């Protein structure tokens, strides 16, 4: 990865191991505000297998704030997952890897283009939530997982009805960890604000199997275990929005 | 534009009418303690006497332009380069700091303005989150002549006229700031002059810097501004926090 892109050897990369006892509580971290996320069924959205993940392109109007006047627009979401019972979250908590992880990528409203934002502090912000195994089938996730067979081939795509993107995220928007790092694939650009929800979302075992067994990647590989190894904090302190 | 007279500042720049402006009144009881706020770190601030620097009466303040290689970090991965410093002050028996603490205005204030290392130019940084960072310290009266400040203040007579400048030897720029880099307030706000762009990270030191009565009088009584007015009381009114939470690096 450093071979094909030197930025991946920077000092301040993602993902990282979260250690809640070492997190710094700041009461200045207010609840996340996410407006415009309740999409109607039409227009439909592009869902695509890009060889690294499944990506869902989001329309204009999904507004997000990390604080007063620190506003963002959602661009896309994608997921990270494992294989055959083995977990594939990117972030870990006290060394525990979760079954999967959802990432919603946003662009700061101070930047008109993603390419201006790359490498600039706070230019990009990702909301990250862990996916765990639960007893019930998750309705929000089923809308996407049920469409994966259609895009099983690397590079294929389809159109899916609009859905409540906020329904894919955990219950409490006031409880999260936050630090600054990087994209977890090339170009590994730094200055990305990562916000990792404390609470998780639950999908059924079948849903998780569907996530990790349907899509194919580059060559004849299954699209599985699409997570980067944990990176050192190098002095960065993870903040927490709760004591 | 000028202090206490037209043109309103919104008519110069719409950003001067933003919700999240500086300076602010720091109420430390309402400050949020955050232990992620580590000691500030400065590199390259101890300058050789040559090349000289340019000290300028710009009509709104006295500024010292800083050379390239002055690096400042707010934390791991939060790196900045110093551009310049300037001052805010009052007048005979009247304080003129920009920031206040529980309504108290200090005699004067130093600001060292920095540019994030993600940006090559100021104009790309303006209005971007964390693009600009300012270090701010209050100036109070102490019993001794401050030798670092004397290097600048002894040259103000040469630049009494609006728009005049003079060359001064390099000095230890960090000697114009408090020795305590651990204890500070930090919030997001704006430039306090047009264009009043937001996204500026303000760091205000707990510890103050001491100047003599004579030095403080020299600072407020020597310079002339726009017209035939004395350059005095060159501070912007405090702006409402409007929901922002000031952070503190100590409980
Ligand atoms: N974990 S991540 O958020 O850093 C990440 C991925 F892991 C990832 F696989 C992708 S991907 O779907 O696009 C495939 C590899 O690029 C994006 N996508 C982009 C989101 C838009 C921001 C601009 C930078 C490119 C990343 C991406 F941002
Ligand atoms: N208080 S402040 O830090 O927001 C401020 C001033 F009050 C001030 F008076 C000046 S000045 O002396 O240079 C007068 C012109 O405004 C600057 N200076 C500039 C620093 C360069 C980077 C930001 C653009 C313009 C302000 C300045 F940044
Ligand atoms: Zn991702
Ligand atoms: Zn200033």
Smallest CA-to-CA distance from A177 within B79, B243, B36 is with B36
Cβ B194 vs Cβ B2: under 8 Å: no
Secondary structure percentages of chain A, helix, strand, coil, to 5: 15, 35, 50
Report the CATH fold assignment for B1-251.
Carbonic Anhydrase II (3.10.200)
First and final C-alpha spacing in chain B? 40
Report resolution (Å) to 1 decimal. Answer: 2.0
CA-based nearest residue in chain B for residue A238? B36
Cis peptide before A223 (omega within 30 of 0): no
For residues B231, B233, B236, B237, the Cα torsion angle rounded to the nearest 10 degrees is -160
SS3 category, A182: strand
Cis peptide before A102 (omega within 30 of 0): no
**Most B CBs within 10 Å, among A13, A14, A69, A116, to test the B interface:** A69
Q: Which residue has the tokens 């809308």?
A: A143
Chain B residues lying within 8 Å of A109, measured CB to CB: none
Chain A residues lying within 8 Å of B78, measured CB to CB: 121, 180
Angle, CA B116 vertex, CA B88 and CA B133 arms, to 5°: 25
Binding residues of A: 78, 80, 103, 184-185
Identify which of A26, A69, A120 has the shortest CB distance to residue B20: A69
Helix (H) or strand (E) holding A63: strand A63-67
Secondary structure percentages of chain B, helix, strand, coil, to 5: 15, 35, 50
Smallest CA-to-CA distance from A32 within A128, A111, A120, A99 is with A128
Contacts of residue A127, defined as CB under 8 A and 6 or more positions apart, other chains included, come to: A32, A64, A103, A104, A106, A169, A195, A197
Return the CATH number of the domain spanning residue range A1-243. 3.10.200.10
Q: How many residues does chain B have?
A: 251
What are the boundaries of each domain within chain B? Answer: 1-251
Helix (H) or strand (E) holding B153: helix B147-153
Count of other CB atoms within 10 angstroms of residue B243 = 11
SS3 category, B220: helix
**A92 bridge partner residues:** A17, A97
Tell me the DSSP string of B85-129.
EEEEE-BTTB---SSEETTEEPSEEEEEEEEETT-SSHHHHTTST
Contacts of residue B11, defined as CB under 8 A and 6 or more positions apart, other chains included, come to: none
Cα A142 → chain centroid = 17
Cβ B98 vs Cβ B235: under 8 Å: yes
Tell me the DSSP string of B170-195.
--BGGGGS-S--S-EEEEEEE-SSTT
**The two three-digit tokens of residue A229, written as one number:** 């190894």
Q: Which residue has the tokens 């590199």?
A: B43
Contacts of residue B5, defined as CB under 8 A and 6 or more positions apart, other chains included, come to: none
Identify which of B77, B130, B242 has the shortest CB distance to residue A236: B77
Buried/exposed B145-178: b ≥16 CB within 10 Å, e otherwise: ebebbbbbbebbeebeebeebeebebbebbebbb
Chain A residues lying within 8 Å of B131, measured CB to CB: 120-121
Tell me the DSSP string of B160-174.
-STT-EEEE---BGG
User: Do strands B104-105 and B100-101 pair parallel, antiparallel, or not at all (unpaired)?
Assistant: antiparallel
Angle, CA B203 vertex, CA A30 and CA B183 arms, to 5°: 95
Cβ B18 vs Cβ B200: under 8 Å: no
Q: How far apart are CA B84 and CA B66, in angstroms?
A: 5
Contacts of residue A196, defined as CB under 8 A and 6 or more positions apart, other chains included, come to: A18, A91, A128, A129, A130, A176, A177, A178
Smallest CA-to-CA distance from B223 within B157, B160, B164, B155 is with B160
Which chain residues have CB less than 5 Å from ligand 4, an ion?
B 111
- Supply φ then ψ for residue A107, to 5 degrees: -115, 130
Eight-class DSSP state of A223: S
Alpha helices in A158-242 (DSSP H): 205-213
A with B: how many residue pairs have Cβ under 8 Å apart? 80
**The two three-digit tokens of residue B103, written as one number:** 């309504």
Cα B4 → chain centroid = 19
């Amino acid at each position: 990865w450093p071979r094909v892109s030197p930025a991946c050897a920077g000092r301040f990369q993602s993902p990282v191991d979260i250690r809640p006892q070492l997190a710094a509580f700041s009461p200045a971290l207010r609840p996340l505000e996410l407006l415009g996320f309740q999409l109607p069924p039409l227009p439909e959205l592009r869902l695509r297998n890009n060889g690294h993940s499944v990506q869902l392109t989001l329309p204009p109007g999904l507004e997000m704030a990390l604080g007063p006047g620190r506003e963002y627009r959602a661009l896309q979401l994608h997921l990270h997952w494992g294989a055959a019972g083995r977990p594939g979250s990117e972030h870990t908590v006290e060394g525990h890897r979760f079954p999967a992880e959802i990432h919603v990528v946003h662009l700061s409203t101070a930047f008109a283009r993603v390419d201006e934002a790359l490498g600039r502090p706070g230019g990009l912000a990702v909301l990250a939530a862990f996916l765990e195994e639960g007893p019930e089938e998750n309705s929000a996730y089923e809308q996407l997982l049920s469409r994966l067979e259609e895009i099983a081939e690397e590079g294929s795509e389809t159109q899916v009805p609009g859905l409540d993107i906020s329904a894919l995220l955990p219950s409490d928007f006031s409880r999260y960890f936050q630090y600054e790092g990087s994209l977890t694939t090339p170009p590994c650009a730094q200055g990305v604000i990562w916000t990792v929800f404390n609470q998780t979302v639950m999908l059924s075992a079948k849903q998780l199997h569907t996530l990790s067994d349907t899509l194919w990647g580059p060559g004849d590989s299954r699209l599985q275990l699409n997570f980067r190894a944990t990176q050192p904090l190098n002095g960065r302190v993870i903040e927490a929005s709760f004591p």
